[PDB]
Design a protein around this ligand. Structure first.
Ligand code: MG
Ligand code: MG
Ligand code: MG
Ligand code: MG
Ligand code: MG
Lengths: 437, 437
């Protein structure tokens, strides 16, 4: 059935190379592209880079591509694998590599084959990809569930000037009745925000960060949040749009404490916050703003700070760098009551099967799952089908700007259209989209 | 045989709606997404926008989509057209509309059908799209020619704060031996530029505009160009990277004069330049920098200035605003010897046949053709296959950032790989790509 496996270098949305895999069967040629994060969690599966400073700023993926072409491909073609059996596909890939963190072959060599295999399988079954992914995950299909998009609108933190410590501010049109409506009203908030931002901060603050949000020089979280509320009001959608945060607090964690002025080299060490103090800051925000989700409020191994905040949070708390889409870390997060939602990034773990397992483990513990892009994305639309397949009710895949983001959101429009009356929009029920009836 | 024509609303790279068309035949379903264009203006084909301020900021395409679904579709399917006959497809669409500027049905409605048909045609012929497009254009196929990418790196004019009057600064890796090498060395130059820009102008100057270039607050053409030269040198590619400009001088044309300080509201009239004075500035830039192409050096109707400059320019002069991909304007520009290259925007004319014809007329006059993106692009890769089909040697499709830009550049990588020894890179011969042997 699988007659050829092939990899090439292509460019991601930041202009860095990444791995593209093609798998050939009797049904044709199936393409998958591997995304790439920035400042990746210490516990992420290995993204293999060449480190040749004379090529691509040291960011080549020739070694990973060669691992697909020269290592995986001939073994895989000769293994006679049934692509419909994703578990077998991934058991085979994992066994070749033989390392816990996929450092022998690279997670970016393994994932492309893993994903392409599922695309070939959907074609063999003559079903759209989301239907096949629902099969793999054993999700309920009457109805299917369309996700609330968590749309990045404003960018802070590492990639941003100003003193704004928190990294992502998202809007979530939970009040919409359909995905199409959600994306329309979201886009309208975005345009109002871009307009407000250019008027208040100058023409250049209207330019966008890696995920398509505006990135003005903002001083505080309150300034950013007041700006967003203004955009929601101006677009006329007050009451229909909620807010999500990704704090990316690992970026400002220094020896036990949290430096909210970490962009300032002469930061006052005596002003760095403890776990409980930072949690106080979040509660202050949650009281003044319609915040329904907070991601990585504390650092990637700061278990105690997570568990403490979770007792009284009362809103969705999303694990990203804490859990790294890794069932082993998710088990720890569940036991410790650290969070109540998984940010699912297939390339943090390296296979579709492990990713599906991570989602299933989360759902089983009463957690939600927010399927996620990476900050370096591509024209690949896999995660749009994956979020529907997993029935999660929520995705973050960027601002409604830059087509590595729109490709996913557009694919959701297509899936919504196709599904017709056998789909429902998760809306206010996004957190438990998987249990929505 | 076409059994179905269908349209839906999707989002472009700026978060504005655009038309997506699907044409169904026995070979399957074939999709086109149209870039954004103009809904008002002289000489160019007009896309249809809804103008409902309560939806999508007035930029809905529901009417255009309806025109496809309720008008074009039933008549098109009924007419039983041979999709391989692109001329007949386009004559049919043009006739149904009945207006010179496609304003009855919308250029967006028409173009979507035009393009989807060529994809269906390629499939019927069992050839890649670029091969079918070469057939339609009667271009030479031994070898095929891969284009030099003119990569946007830096924007000024109305696309930035500061005083920089000129709009676009591009790099052209003419010194590369393959398209793959050209894109690699181009991305390295861009990263170095992004790095230098953030160091010299602050972190926010690293945010990207619509087409992926940076927009720091720059004072002069010289300052921008010195910055680009530094980036080229830092990447190690001096001698291999050339520069293209888009002056967009229509933006700073007031009276019969050119105001290089147009962003200053108290700008000093009488410091404004005549044609010949502006030509002196371009000449001084040409002596100091490796500029091989200048787009829109003079205003869209200032024919005498264009013709005067062209006599002694000695480098590629590209018509954009002057010609607006309009056959009558092109003929005039050819006769007046105003320029020697056409910026070809398929959605500015509205059909593939007319786009191809405009290119052929340019080539017949010894002009080059630069296939061009739009500000609002999509994940659709059509123009990558078009530039190859037209054998032009040059494409302008954005910075190596944002995937509406990278989708095209990636598709060119794939096309190059597929063609192998059947293709050559245009390199230094970009201007006469079509005549290259
Ligand atoms: Mg090795
Ligand atoms: Mg099923
Ligand atoms: Mg995160
Ligand atoms: Mg041919
Ligand atoms: Mg122009």
């Amino acid at each position: 059935a699988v007659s050829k496996v092939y990899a090439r270098s292509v460019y991601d949305s930041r202009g860095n190379p990444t791995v593209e895999v093609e798998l050939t069967t009797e049904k044709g040629v199936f393409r998958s592209i591997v995304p790439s994060g920035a400042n990746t969690g210490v516990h992420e599966a290995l993204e293999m880079r060449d480190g040749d400073k004379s090529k691509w700023m040291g960011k080549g993926v020739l070694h990973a591509v060669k691992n697909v072409n020269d290592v995986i491909a001939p073994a895989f073609v000769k293994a006679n694998i049934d692509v419909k059996d994703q578990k077998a596909v991934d058991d085979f890939l994992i066994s070749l590599d033989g390392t816990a963190n996929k450092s022998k072959l690279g997670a970016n060599a393994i994932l492309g084959v893993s994903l392409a295999a599922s695309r070939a399988a959907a074609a063999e079954k003559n079903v759209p990809l989301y239907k096949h992914l629902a099969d793999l995950s054993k999700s309920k299909t009457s109805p299917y569930v369309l996700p609330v998009p968590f749309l990045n609108v404003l960018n802070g933190g590492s990639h941003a000037g100003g003193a704004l410590a928190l990294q992502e501010f998202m809007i979530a049109p939970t009040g919409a009745k359909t995905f199409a409506e959600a994306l329309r009203i979201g886009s309208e908030v975005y345009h109002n925000l871009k307009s407000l931002t250019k008027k208040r901060y100058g023409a250049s603050a209207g330019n966008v960060g890696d995920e398509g949000g505006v990135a003005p020089n903002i001083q505080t979280a309150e300034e950013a949040l007041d700006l967003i509320v203004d955009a929601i009001k101006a677009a006329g959608h007050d009451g229909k749009i909620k807010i999500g945060l990704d704090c990316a607090s690992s970026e400002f964690f220094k020896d036990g404490k949290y430096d909210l002025d970490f962009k300032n080299p002469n930061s006052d060490k005596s002003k760095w916050l403890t776990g409980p103090q930072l949690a106080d800051l979040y509660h202050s925000l949650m009281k003044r703003y319609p915040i329904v989700s907070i991601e990585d409020p504390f650092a990637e191994d700061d278990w105690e700070a997570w568990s403490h905040f979770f007792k009284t949070a009362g809103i969705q708390i999303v694990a990203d760098r804490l859990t790294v889409t890794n069932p082993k870390r998710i088990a720890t997060a569940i036991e410790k009551k650290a969070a109540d939602a998984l940010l699912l990034k297939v390339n943090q773990i390296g296979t579709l099967s492990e990713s599906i397992k991570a989602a299933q483990d989360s759902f089983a513990a009463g957690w939600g799952v927010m399927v996620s892009h990476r900050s370096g994305e591509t024209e690949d639309t896999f995660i749009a089908d994956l979020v529907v397949g997993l029935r999660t009710g929520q995705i973050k895949t960027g601002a409604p700007a830059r087509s590595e983001r729109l490709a996913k959101l557009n694919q959701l429009l297509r899936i919504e259209e196709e599904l017709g009356d056998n789909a429902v929009f998760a809306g206010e029920n996004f957190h438990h989209g998987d249990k929505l009836l």
